[PDB]
Design a protein around this ligand. Structure first.
Ligand code: F43
Ligand code: F43
Ligand SMILES: C[C@@H](OP(=O)(O)O)[C@H](NC(=O)CCCCCCS)C(=O)O
Ligand SMILES: C[C@@H](OP(=O)(O)O)[C@H](NC(=O)CCCCCCS)C(=O)O
Ligand SMILES: O=S(=O)(O)CCS
Ligand SMILES: [Cl-]
Ligand SMILES: [Cl-]
Ligand SMILES: [Cl-]
Ligand SMILES: [Cl-]
Ligand SMILES: [K+]
Ligand SMILES: [Kr]
Ligand SMILES: [Kr]
Ligand SMILES: [Kr]
Ligand SMILES: [Kr]
Ligand SMILES: [Kr]
Ligand SMILES: [Kr]
Ligand SMILES: [Kr]
Ligand SMILES: [Kr]
Ligand SMILES: [Kr]
Ligand SMILES: [Kr]
Ligand SMILES: [Kr]
Ligand SMILES: [Mg+2]
Lengths: 264, 558, 433, 433, 153
């Protein structure tokens, strides 16, 4: 079978990018089921999963060859609501960057609906499936609890100066530092919860720079990642060429000019 | 030629916002003041108290913001109009609060250009009339009495209050210097006087030819009560009345119908055509406005064509406000809207810095304005350098990133700087468009983010549709507009496209981009809004020093 | 059932005792062919494309895009371009695709294959396949590339897709775009009268036929010729448009030297009474006679024929199109006063004519007769019994109009002047029976 | 020349080494039949007409015209009304007119005669002739008179003609009115995804075929399948819509138990490389391999099939339609990052998916996947390679949607559930070779 | 001019479908109390003011003083549980000739919003603005009042 290569680049940022894509992300903390459910805010810890429709086994399904050959996730078999987890990541070397959170979801999880935005990244899925995906991301090196957090609303902060204590600005202050640890005492849409979820310690600035997927001038400079620039150029150029005429002869059409690449 | 200086153009605005701040600091103390920090929010809260008391019903209240927080948990910062000393609160640039912005749009919407040659040919052919400078002069007097809504033929007519329609007028213009000089100058757009730089006047007169045209501006109050579809009709009605009087025609004979068809259709140049059913709109609305026309309405090109960047960014300011704030942020949505999606392109001298950097890079690498190769290789080089440099600016200056806090703002400004640089360097709008999408793609891989959820619909369709020639994909940028299919929905592109359409013709040192009639029409200083310095006008509106047309104080009580 | 005698444009008998159904849009192969012809046929203005490229005047309306001229000469390569277009659009060898150079290379006549219509939902495939084939043909012939072909594409397609139509473009149809339809089934109603006059080569009898056929094809598609209303519409088509029983031709000829609108009114009434279509109903004390219609649909058809003959006699005498609006109004106003029976389309021709007169003599819109059509808000209101007269008036005009057929529709004349259905529509309809 | 093997919805071989041209919308008789079927077939909501008349709710949207109720019970007289409608619209005994009572009298399935489409310029004759025939049938059956028939007419036609559509009416089509076309040739693109899912009876492989066929029929009518672009579009139809070489079916099965968007990306690249569609071009210092397309049109077709399989795998696993927008986006974003080749429709599927994601998760418009269609401003931008996936996702949904197919398109299921071309599209297309 | 502006800036929008969505997809319970919170939210947001994001710029409340939203319903029990400043009182306005009972019977136990966007907006723009402007701020208000994700399916 085909062996994926995922992404170009040779810097340690590109290596981190392939870790997120390939799902090979080290575990740095533990979050209890109850604590995670409490922060996500869709049901009371220990409560039964609400449903949006009956379990598939109970109501049956249309005669569909795709349905009969694609296995439903546990949440879909049960008829769970579609709920979500949503994260914001600082541009000051947070481990994760929005698109690569979505690639991590799309490559490594089934029946997921990821969405990428500059200041928020969302995964919608059947509730129990969404919880498992959220647990995997939040317990992993894709997450610093100071440079990233759950924010289902009022997300402002990814592009702002960090607070003096290194916490990313949150208008609703859903998280705060208590004795070196990040505590979450509101759910992801700002409602106070009757518990204190301990998300462990923030990454050191040096750890963040080692673990991050972002290029910027105080880490791996984007200007120096010529393999990534070559890839961008190649894809743009070929898109341009084949929109003109979808054939290899388009690659030397008048107007292309002396296109050239750094590493190939 | 231009030389990019040692200090970044955006630093002044940062220092004026943050006196004493070390601009390299990545951290800040948050005091979580809430709305009381900000005079404009405090004034709004008090306005809302009056509103609720006067009407008996709750309205504005900062405390309704969710989460038990009011706006201003961080510092609420003001905005400097680029190239201007004026710093304003952000709410002062909301189109609803800014009468200069409202009047720029009203001035476009209430304009139609109408040829006179077909009407004169009708009078000769059907009535055997002689058309002379004297008969044209009488017509121009008639049409400036009738066009605001006053009577010339019938008895016992009721009329519009002249003071409510004081902005309405009609001027003629022609490439024929001999006729233009024979008509009283109050009725004529003087092409030679307004287009005295770089021989622009001769280019415009050659492109118009010995044809005669009317620039018609119907009253602002009318398009405010009604819509842009009113403009060509209103114009035609009073044109017809004026021909009836000026040529002693029957007040309603078959030949008058020929004048109507000419004024309404055959010789009518709309600013914008209609739109399809999902976004149904009359003509002369922003969705139908082409980028070439938008760029030709802006008049900085006739003032200082030797600095193509200045005109380019004035077009950006014109288009981003119109297309994002008024059109997409109101016509096509509404509410709080899209003020800062647009202000990113015309405040704090950020786009200016990124673009002048590119201009300098291109001048030293490729040579003078308009001489760079019209090819994809060149667009790739310019866009990548301009985008990398801008990204490094955001990375090196934390408060610059904080200003353009949404990725969509950064995407539009980095891509605009890239495409404006390319347009000025190559003189080619279509090549510049390749650079626009190149910037987006470079940007996305640098930061693993670009814009909002649906920002790059057109940008991922983008590169491949630049050089398509298929029916609903292929189109030169000058003729693209806010109804080009990929562009029909999303903020952070349309005004920038207008901008670098202008940049390409400024780089080529052309007098216009797309229609010389539009160019001459909007140079006329008798318009309410000053189309030659967009950002200075916006500053006036934000400071409550812009006087719009269309108010009703003459006919309402105190 | 109903039968009619069919007559040609010179008043010669073609066929006798033809079943009225045999000239129906749903049955007559010649009518079906005429519809197919106007749907799939387009004209290409190669001279306009050449001019737009050489002068960078893409989009028209005085537009000029400095620096973006493309120096190509398609009118000098018209045969080669025509051959490529044919190859690109033809579906099968020997199919009904036609591509013909006209005007010495200035224009192309493009009859797109019927299969491309069949394979779609509307009629635009002729326009779009031709525009695309031409864009490709120009790109290949002149070795265009990435950044200039978009401009040449706008020379062909105009401002599409910023606009919904090919505004300022150089692919032409006698139909408009579907989004201009005022309502359901209006596409065949949207044919400018100047176009109709050119289709007929200004033969006014053939113009009546072509325009009436296409109008009633529209009315059938609108669903307004069902049941009893089928007979209503088919009789109007036959007697007003297809010179049934030679009534339009003879009424025009007998009133052509000294006749007026009013003498055609009187002839129509006398023929209706002599033929038994109407009878005296009651007599008022003054001696005025109220008539009754013994066959209501037939009385309408006689009024439709009289309206047309009146148009031919009055506009013919004026040699001017503008009198058609008053002819339609006063023929029907006065035939009602003469009989106390309702006039053509029960007032809907008269009403159309009231507003049509207004909007061809006022400041508010409209224009000369040549700009109207069955889809025009002013002239849409009769189900097919007004516009054929308008087209005939336009054909009869000897040079009084500003926007004449020659100025707006010259390419239409050249495109269709060798098409048999348009050269002799009455003979073709009769032969199809 | 290109050939493909045709496989059915269960992965069974139907026909081997078929010429690609044989599945063209311009040549395959089954595809041409499908177009004709959706054009001329309408449904009548006789229950809705009865309700509107009994309750004076003409026009819908909570309207009530007090005192103007008309007490009629067409659902109780459905067979008699059906027989009258057929008599009124049938052109020739033995033509393809069909009128069938459904739901015990609540609905009528009306297949208007093809000749009525041929005699027109668009497709609306089915809607208009049926509405007219129904109005006359009700007038006659219930002895309606001068002043109540207009109200019953609005029960059938809705607010037409104050509106251009039969808004609030009870004659339904899977097509919209032509004036809603965003551009030239878009009528067959304007088919709500909920409709497509019902046409397929929620058989996802059949949904892909039905939707892909109609999308590409639209693209042909837009003029965007000419010359080289014909091969481009036909390969996408064959591989994404017609399960060419069983690749959509096999890739979905291969990834159906444990697979994801990403594993379908990997399988697509592996197949393209193994099949010689792509090869290694150059290797970067890191070891990253830049690929090249040896056959550009075929690389697109493989990406198009992978986009569809990825939708079936990811939406199939969720049993939820909403993931189609992210599937289309990330399948193509990641396949570009994996190969340095452009993805499906060279970014236009990814771009459509960006805006579709936005407009199915935001305040600004759109909705759930079932409200989109190829004419929707959000989802029109790919030439046919996005919507078939959307329709499939809608069909795979197990009940997460507010505006589900059974709530907006129940009558579509009943109307077409016994139509062979919708029951087994893949088999009929292969049999028509 | 104001009579026409009052017509043009008006759109009527049902609430039942929105409440059904919150129940079905989110499992939310819709109560008089949640509706009351929604009506406060929508009368802050509809004139052009912010409820979710940070660093938003807003319309001057005095320029949009004519903009407001009220609800109305054939269900007297619900109309009675909402602060009367937010409700069109059908029974008080239609007291003559039993008109109120005819209206309530024709509307049924369904809930509607009468939305009136700012005059200044339709004067700058057109009547097509009205239903879009209404929907944007209705959406913002549901997000706040039911603790939704600010942007989910
Ligand atoms: C609810 C949505 C989803 C949607 O459909 N529109 C919203 C909200 C909407 C509201 C917010 C008004 C309010 O606060 O009550 C308005 C003003 C439109 C309106 N209804 O008038 C708006 N956004 Ni939004 N929206 C914006 C933006 C953004 C950025 C903000 C990111 C950040 O770090 O702060 C992100 C998208 C992204 O991540 O790229 C965003 C998302 C979102 N945007 C999320 C809310 C995010 C949150 O929970 O905080 N907007 C921007 O990126 C800048 C311009 C800004 C717009 C207002 C202006 O232009 O002045 C506003 C444009
Ligand atoms: C030029 C036309 C042809 C046309 O297309 N419109 C005209 C003129 C137009 C102008 C006259 C303005 C002016 O005096 O400059 C305006 C105001 C429309 C406009 N352009 O604003 C108008 N008519 Ni007219 N027009 C009117 C009318 C009329 C009546 C007036 C007959 C009489 O005995 O006075 C007659 C038609 C008729 O005979 O029925 C008429 C004709 C005509 N009407 C004749 C001019 C007649 C003349 O030579 O005096 N209007 C009316 O009948 C009353 C309403 C009145 C309108 C103004 C208002 O409503 O306040 C005005 C409506
Ligand atoms: C006919 C049509 O004009 P055109 O022929 O399309 O120019 C139409 N005007 C009108 O109907 C004007 C009606 C108002 C003035 C006359 C009132 S009686 C319009 O502008 O769309
Ligand atoms: C998509 C479409 O909405 P519908 O799906 O038709 O409701 C369209 N809106 C828009 O494009 C909104 C554009 C402005 C707001 C978002 C800017 S990114 C419109 O209202 O006609
Ligand atoms: O959050 S979304 O990208 O949907 C809207 C941004 S204004
Ligand atoms: Cl190839
Ligand atoms: Cl009948
Ligand atoms: Cl009778
Ligand atoms: Cl080709
Ligand atoms: K207005
Ligand atoms: Kr958590
Ligand atoms: Kr976190
Ligand atoms: Kr303000
Ligand atoms: Kr008066
Ligand atoms: Kr004119
Ligand atoms: Kr405009
Ligand atoms: Kr330059
Ligand atoms: Kr990325
Ligand atoms: Kr033509
Ligand atoms: Kr249907
Ligand atoms: Kr602010
Ligand atoms: Mg210079």
């Amino acid at each position: 079978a085909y062996t994926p290569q995922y992404y170009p680049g040779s810097s340690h940022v590109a290596v981190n990018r392939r870790k997120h894509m390939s799902g090979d992300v080290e575990k740095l903390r533990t979050v209890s089921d109850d604590d995670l459910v409490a922060a996500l805010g869709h049901r009371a810890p220990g409560a039964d999963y609400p449903s949006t429709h009956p379990p598939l086994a109970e109501m049956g399904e249309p005669d569909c060859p795709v349905r009969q050959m694609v296995e439903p996730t546990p949440g879909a078999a049960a008829g769970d609501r579609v709920r979500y987890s949503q994260f914001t990541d600082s541009m000051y070397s947070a481990p994760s960057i929005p698109y690569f959170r979505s690639y991590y979801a799309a490559i490594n999880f089934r029946g997921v609906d990821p969405g990428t935005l500059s200041g928020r990244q969302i995964v919608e899925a059947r509730e129990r499936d969404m919880e498992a995906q959220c647990k995997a991301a939040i317990e992993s090196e894709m997450t610093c609890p100071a440079l990233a957090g759950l924010r289902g609303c009022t997300v402002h902060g990814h592009s702002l100066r960090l607070a003096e204590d290194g916490m990313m600005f949150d208008m609703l202050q859903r998280t705060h530092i208590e004795g070196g640890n990040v505590i979450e005492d509101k759910d992801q849409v700002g409602v106070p919860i009757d518990r204190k979820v301990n998300l462990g310690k923030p990454m050191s600035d040096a750890e963040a720079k080692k673990r991050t997927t972002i290029y910027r001038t105080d880490g791996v400079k984007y200007r120096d990642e010529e393999e990534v620039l070559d890839h961008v150029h190649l894809v743009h150029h070929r898109r341009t060429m084949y929109g003109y005429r979808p054939e290899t002869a388009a690659e030397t059409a008048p107007g292309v000019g002396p296109v050239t690449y750094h590493t190939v | 030629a231009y030389k990019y200086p040692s200090e970044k153009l955006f630093v002044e605005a940062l220092k004026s916002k943050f006196a004493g701040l070390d601009l390299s600091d990545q951290k800040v103390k948050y005091v979580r003041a809430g709305y009381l920090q900000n005079a404009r929010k405090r004034e709004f809260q008090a306005a809302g108290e009056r509103v609720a008391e006067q009407r008996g019903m709750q309205q504005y209240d900062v405390n309704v913001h969710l989460g038990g927080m009011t706006l201003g948990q961080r510092q609420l910062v003001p905005y400097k109009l680029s190239t201007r000393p004026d710093i304003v609160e952000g709410d002062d640039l909301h189109y609803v609060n800014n009468p200069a912005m409202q009047q720029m749009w009203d001035d476009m919407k209430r304009t139609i250009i109408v040829g006179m040659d077909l009407a004169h040919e009708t009078l000769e052919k059907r009535l055997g009339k002689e058309v002379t400078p004297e008969s044209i002069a009488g017509y121009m007097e008639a049409v400036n009495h009738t066009m605001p809504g006053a009577a010339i033929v019938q008895e016992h007519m009721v009329e519009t209050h002249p003071g409510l329609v004081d902005d309405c007028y009609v001027k003629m213009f022609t490439g024929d210097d001999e006729l233009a000089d024979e008509i009283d100058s109050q009725y004529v757009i003087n092409i030679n006087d307004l287009f005295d730089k770089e021989g622009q006047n001769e280019k415009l007169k050659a492109a118009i030819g010995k044809t005669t045209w009317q620039a018609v501006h119907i009253p602002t109050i009318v398009v405010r009560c009604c819509d842009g579809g009113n403009t060509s009709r209103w114009s035609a009605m009073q044109i017809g009345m004026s021909f009836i009087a000026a040529y002693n025609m029957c007040a309603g004979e078959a030949a008058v119908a020929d004048l109507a068809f000419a004024a309404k259709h055959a010789a009518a140049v709309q600013m914008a055509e209609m739109l399809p059913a999902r976004r149904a709109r009359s003509p002369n609305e922003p969705g139908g406005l082409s980028f070439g026309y938008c760029a030709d309405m802006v008049q900085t090109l006739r003032v200082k064509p030797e600095d193509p960047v200045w005109y380019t960014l004035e077009v950006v300011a014109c288009g981003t406000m119109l297309y994002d704030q008024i059109w997409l942020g109101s016509y096509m949505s509404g509410g709080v809207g899209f003020t800062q999606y647009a202000t990113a392109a015309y405040t704090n001298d950020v786009l200016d810095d990124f673009t002048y950097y590119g201009y300098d890079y291109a001048l030293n690498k490729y040579g003078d304005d308009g001489t760079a190769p019209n090819d994809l290789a060149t667009a790739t080089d310019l866009a990548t350098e301009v985008t990398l440099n801008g990204m490094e600016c955001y990375e090196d200056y934390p408060t610059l990133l904080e200003d353009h806090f949404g990725g969509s703002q950064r995407a539009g400004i980095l891509a605009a700087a890239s495409a404006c640089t390319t347009g000025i360097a190559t003189g080619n709008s279509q090549v510049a468009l390749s650079a626009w999408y190149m910037s987006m793609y470079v940007h996305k891989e640098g930061w693993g983010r670009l814009g909002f959820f649906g920002y790059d619909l057109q940008d991922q369709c983008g590169a491949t549709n630049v050089c398509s020639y298929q029916g609903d994909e292929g189109c030169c940028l000058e003729l693209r507009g806010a109804n080009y299919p990929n562009y029909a929905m999303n903020v952070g592109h349309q005004g920038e496209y207008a901008g670098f359409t202008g940049s390409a013709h400024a780089g080529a040192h052309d007098a216009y981009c797309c229609n010389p009639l539009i160019k001459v029409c909007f140079a006329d200083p008798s318009l309410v809004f000053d189309f030659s310095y967009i950002r200075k006008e916006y500053a006036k509106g934000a400071m409550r020093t812009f006087r719009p047309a269309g108010e009703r104080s003459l006919v309402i009580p105190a | 059932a109903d039968t009619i005698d069919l007559y040609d444009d010179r008043g010669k008998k073609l066929k006798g005792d033809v079943d009225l159904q045999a000239v129906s849009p749903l049955k007559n192969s010649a009518i079906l062919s005429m519809v197919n012809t106007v749907k799939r046929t387009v004209a290409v203005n190669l001279a306009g494309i050449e001019k737009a490229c050489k002068n960078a005047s893409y989009g028209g309306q005085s537009r000029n895009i400095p620096g973006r001229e493309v120096d190509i000469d398609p009118t000098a390569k018209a045969d080669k371009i025509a051959a490529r277009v044919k190859e690109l659009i033809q579906v099968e060898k020997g199919d009904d695709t036609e591509v013909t150079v006209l005007g010495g290379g200035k224009f192309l006549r493009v009859a797109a294959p019927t299969r491309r219509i069949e394979a779609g939902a509307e009629y635009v495939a002729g326009m779009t396949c031709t525009a695309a084939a031409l864009t490709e043909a120009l790109r290949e012939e002149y070795n265009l590339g990435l950044y200039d072909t978009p401009y040449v594409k706008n020379a062909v397609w105009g401002t599409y897709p910023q606009t919904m139509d090919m505004k300022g473009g150089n692919v032409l149809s006698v139909l408009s775009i579907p989004q201009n339809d005022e309502g359901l089934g209006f596409a065949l109603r949207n044919i400018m009268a100047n176009h109709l006059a050119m289709l007929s080569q200004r033969n006014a009898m053939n113009c009546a036929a072509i325009s009436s056929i296409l109008e009633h094809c529209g009315v059938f598609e609108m669903g307004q010729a069902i049941g009893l209303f089928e007979r209503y519409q088919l009789l109007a088509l036959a007697y007003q448009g297809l010179n049934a029983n030679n009534m339009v031709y003879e009424m025009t000829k007998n009133n052509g030297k000294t006749g007026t609108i009013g003498t055609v009114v009187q002839e129509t009434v006398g023929r209706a009474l002599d033929d038994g279509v109407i009878s005296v109903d009651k007599t008022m004390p003054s001696g005025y006679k109220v008539y009754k219609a013994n066959d209501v649909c037939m009385w309408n058809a006689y009024c439709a024929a009289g309206t047309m003959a009146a148009t031919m006699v009055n506009c013919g005498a004026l040699r001017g199109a503008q009198a058609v609006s008053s002819t339609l109004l006063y023929f029907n106003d006065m035939i009602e006063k003469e009989t106390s029976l309702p006039g053509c389309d029960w007032g809907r021709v008269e009403g159309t004519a009231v507003g049509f007169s207004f909007f061809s003599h006022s400041i508010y819109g409209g224009g000369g007769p040549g700009v109207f059509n069955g889809n025009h808000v002013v002239t849409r209101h009769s189900t097919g019994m007004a516009i054929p007269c308008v087209a005939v008036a336009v054909a009869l005009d000897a040079g009084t109009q500003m926007f004449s057929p020659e100025s707006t529709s010259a390419i239409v004349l050249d495109t269709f002047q060798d098409v048999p259905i348009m050269m002799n529509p009455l003979k073709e309809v009769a032969a199809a029976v």
